[PDB]
Amino acid sequence: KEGYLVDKNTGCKYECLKLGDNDYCLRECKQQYGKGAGGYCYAFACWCTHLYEQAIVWPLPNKRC
């Protein structure tokens, strides 16, 4: 599964600065979804990849940003 990284408390996406390959997004995605996750910077937001199918990504059902 793929999707925008989301702050589980605020419902916000995670903003990044350098488009494309991005170690910030990579590490934040892994920190959230686990060591198998990938991630890169897309339109200045962190887009996570290789997520387990049940993973919760942006947007949060309950919480709007």
Epitope: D7, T10, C12, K13, Y14, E15, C16, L17, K18, L19, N22, Y24, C25, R27, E28, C41, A43, F44, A45
Partner: antibody, heavy 117, light 108 residues
Framework: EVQLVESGGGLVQPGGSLRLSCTGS????????MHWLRQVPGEGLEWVSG????????DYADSVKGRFTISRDDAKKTLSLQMNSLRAEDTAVYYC??????????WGQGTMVTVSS | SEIVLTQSPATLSVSPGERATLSCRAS??????LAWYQQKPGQAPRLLFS???NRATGIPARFTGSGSGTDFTLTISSLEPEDFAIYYC?????????FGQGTKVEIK
């Protein structure tokens, strides 16, 4: 309400240095990417530099790379921009802005920076 | 080569109560990654829309953004006096992020 307040602007000669600071209030400062942009009076907008949450991702406009250094102090809720080797064309109002994930969703009132001999 | 945003017209002369239609054309597709700002005389920019159509908080209903790809518009359905300002578009599909040259909406 979400507010940003810039300081540290002023007049210097070419080759001089300034340190801009921005203090944020009314929001959780450490939860947002923060940016500096600038606007020559009477002219358009230009993004200058920006820094992600946790200072994990940092970038600069090509025209200021090697000369400007951005940093943040989350405890103090401050963003800083050390501007060295200032040039005439760096003259502008400098704005601090909160990142809106692509856009810039909140802007300070700006601080004037003049570089002139 | 960076994305060029062409805003037209450069100036738009209109009467209060009237409708204003501002155009932003991108040199190539920016999908929906386009923001609009208003800058009133003697003030800092103010975000109006992001993702082309998403209203920022406190922006009156009379403002709407639309479009995708290369052609975007900002529409003000019925101009209030405070609506007379400069308006900028800004893309964020690519780096460097770029702005249009602005459209001034002024009294007729």
């Amino acid at each position: 309400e979400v507010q940003l307040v810039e300081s540290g602007g002023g007049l210097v000669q070419p080759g001089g240095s300034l340190r801009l600071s921005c203090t944020g209030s009314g929001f959780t400062f450490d939860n947002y990417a923060m940016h500096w942009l600038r606007q020559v009076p009477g002219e358009g907008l230009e993004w200058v530099s920006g820094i992600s949450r946790s200072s994990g991702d940092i970038d600069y406009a090509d025209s200021v790379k090697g000369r400007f250094t951005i940093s943040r102090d989350d405890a103090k809720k401050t963003l800083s921009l050390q501007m060295n080797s200032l040039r005439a064309e760096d003259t502008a109002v400098y704005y601090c802005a909160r990142g809106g994930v692509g856009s810039f969703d909140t802007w300070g009132q700006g601080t004037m920076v003049t570089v002139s001999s | 080569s960076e994305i060029v945003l062409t805003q037209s017209p450069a100036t738009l002369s209109v009467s209060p109560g009237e409708r204003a239609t501002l155009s932003c054309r991108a040199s190539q597709s920016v999908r929906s990654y386009l923001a609009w700002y208003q800058q009133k005389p003697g003030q800092a920019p103010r975000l109006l829309f992001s993702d082309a159509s998403n209203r920022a908080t406190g922006i009156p209903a009379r403002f709407t953004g639309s479009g995708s790809g290369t052609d975007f518009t900002l529409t003000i359905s019925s101009l209030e006096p405070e609506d007379f300002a400069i308006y900028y578009c800004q893309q964020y599909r690519y780096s460097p992020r770029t702005f249009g040259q602005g459209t001034k909406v002024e009294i007729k």
